[PDB]
Amino acid sequence: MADKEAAFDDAVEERVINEEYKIWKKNTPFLYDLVMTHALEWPSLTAQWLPDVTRPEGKDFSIHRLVLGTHTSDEQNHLVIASVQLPNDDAQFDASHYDSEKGEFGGFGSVSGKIEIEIKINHEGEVNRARYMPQNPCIIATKTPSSDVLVFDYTKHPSKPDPSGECNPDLRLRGHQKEGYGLSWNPNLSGHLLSASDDHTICLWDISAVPKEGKVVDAKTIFTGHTAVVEDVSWHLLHESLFGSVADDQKLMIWDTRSNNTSKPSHSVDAHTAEVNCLSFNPYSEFILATGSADKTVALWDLRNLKLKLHSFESHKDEIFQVQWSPHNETILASSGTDRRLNVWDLSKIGEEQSPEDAEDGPPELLFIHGGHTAKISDFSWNPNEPWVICSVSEDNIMQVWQMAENIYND
Template identity: 65%
Template sequence: MGKDEEEMRGEIEERLINEEYKIWKKNTPFLYDLVITHALEWPSLTVEWLPDREEPPGKDYSVQKMILGTHTSENEPNYLMLAQVQLPLDDSENDARHYDDDRSDFGGFGCANGKVQIIQQINHDGEVNRARYMPQNPFLIATKTVSAEVYVFDYSKHPSKPPLDGACSPDLRLRGHSTEGYGLSWSKFKEGHLLSGSDDAQICLWDINAAPKNKSLEAMQIFKVHEGVVEDVAWHLRHEYLFGSVGDDQYLLIWDLRTPSVSKPVQSVVAHQSEVGVSILNASFRLSHEDTCTCTHRHSRYLLYKFPFFVLVFPLFPSLQHYLN
C-alpha cells in the first residue's frame, strides 16, 4: 500500500469516527443520566477513579478524583496526572434534555456545574501505559512504563506541578520484566501485592512491603507459561490466592499461589480459536463473584467462564463489533 493510499484511508477513517461521534453525542440524553466531556491536551491510555469523595458544604455537587496519564509525541514530556471532577448529587435537579457543546473543549448535560480539572502532574519516563491505585492506600499508584520497569508513586509526596528539569522520581522501581506491557492489578486482600503482565510473556509478582535496595525491588515470583504477550492480569475478588491472565497465545490461565509450581496454572482455557496468526488483541477480563470470569477480545466474542466446569461464549451485537475491530 502506497503512502498516498494510506493517508487517504486514514482520512476516511477519521471522518467516519467524527461522524459516529456526532451521532453518539446527539443521542446521549437517551443513553445516560449524566455526560461530561473534557478535551485533554494529549491522549490518555489509562483512567481510573480514586475512591475518595467530598461534598463541599452548600454545593449541589460532589468532588471526586481520577487517575490519568499522557501519551505525547517523542519530544514532549509525559506525566502521571490526577484530575478533579465535579459530579452532581443524586438529589440535585438536572436537565438531561440538551447536550451543551457551545465550547469546543468540553460539553455535557445533566450537570450545571460539571467540571474536569487537572490538579497534579508528576514527571513520567515515557507514556503511561496503565496506572492503578493500591486499594489499601490510594495515595500509592503503580504505573506501567514504556521500559521494562513498573513505577510506584506516592502522589502525596510529589508537588502539584512537576520539576522543570523533567526528572522522573518514582518512589519505587519494580524490576523483573524485560519489555513494556499493560497488565497491572493490586490485590485487595494482601496489602502491597502487585501483579504485572508484559510483552515478554511473563507475569511478575511483587510485595512492595519488602525492603527495597536503592528504591528498586526485584520480583518475588515470575510466572512464564504464556507463549506470547500477556495482555492482562487480574486478582480474584473473593479468593486471595487466585489470579488470572490472558495472552496473545489465545489462552486464559487461572493461577493458584498455594500450588508449589509457578510453571503450571490450575486452569488453562483456549479463549479463542482461529487460524494461525490471529491472536487475542487488547484482551481484558475480570475475575468476579464466586468462580466466574468474564473475558472479552476484539474478535466479536464475549466469554463467560465458570471454572472448572463450563464455558459460555456469547457473540457480541453487530453494532458493537465495529468498535472492537
C-alpha cells in the same frame, strides 16, 4: 504504496466517524442523564477513578478524582490526578447536564461540572496503565515503555512538576525485559502487585515490608506459562491466592500462588480464536469472570467448569481492549475497543425473545452502545460511588464522563 492504501482507508473511515458523531450528538438528550465531554491536553492510555469522594454540605455536587496518564512521544509525559465535579443522586435534574447552559425559560439555567488537573508527576516515558492500590489509595503503580514498573506516592511529590524532567519514583520494580500493559493490585494482600508484559512472563512483587524511599525491588515470583505476549492480569477479588491472566496465545490461565510450579498454571482454557486482551473478575460473583479479545467477542466464564464457555457477547466490530464489571450490579458488564464503541451488557436478558426489528439491532443482552468517542477507546472506568457513571478516554485527547438514561436499565 503500503501507506497509500492505509491513508485511503483512514480517510474513508473519517467521513464515517464524522457522520456518526453528529447523529449521536442529536440523540444525546434521549440517551443520557449526564454528558461531560472534556478535551484533554494529551491522550490518556489509562483511566481509573480514585475511590474517595468529598461531598461539601449544602452543594448539589461532589468532588471525584481520576488517575490519568499522558501518551506523548515528546519527553514531558505525566502521571496526572484530575478532579471531576459530579452531581449527587439527591440533586435535581435540569439542563446543567449534557454540557449545556441554556435555560428552559429563555435564558441561563445552571453551570456544568468542571475538570481540572491537581497533581502532575514526571514519568519515564508514557503511562501505559496506572492503577491505585486499594488498601492505600495514595500509592499508584505505573507501566513504562522500559521494563520498569514504577510506584508513586503523590503526597510525597509537589503538585507542579519539575522543569528538569527527572522522574523520581518511590519504588522501582524490575523483573521484566520488555514493556507491557497488565497491572493488578491484590485487595486481600497489601503490596502484592502483578504485571503482564511482552516477554511472555507475569511478575509478582511484594512491597509490603520495604521502605518507599527510591530503592530497587526485584520480583518475588515470575510466572512463565504463556508462550506469547501477556496482555492483562487480574487478581481474584475474594480468594487471595488465585489470579487470572490472558495473552496473545489465545489462552486464559488461572493460577495459584500456593503452587510451586511457576511454569504451569492451575487451569488453562483455549479462550478465543484471536488474541485475548483483557480480563475482569466479577466483584459479586466469585466463580464468574469475563474475557475480551480481538475476535470481536466477550467470553463469559465459570471457574467450576472452565472447559465450557458460558456465553459469547457479540456486537463489537473490531478488537476489544478493556472489559470491566459494574461495581453496583452483578449482571452488568461493559467493554470497549478499536471500533470506537463502549457496549454495556446485561446478562439477565440472555435468551429473551425479541421482535425481528430488535434482532437487527443486536442480541438481547446488549443494553447500551456508547457512541461518543471519535477514536479508539484505550481505557475506561466505572465510578464506584456514583452508579452508572463511566469515565472513558480515547486517542483523540477526548475524555468523556457520562451516565446513561435511567429508563434504559430500570424497568
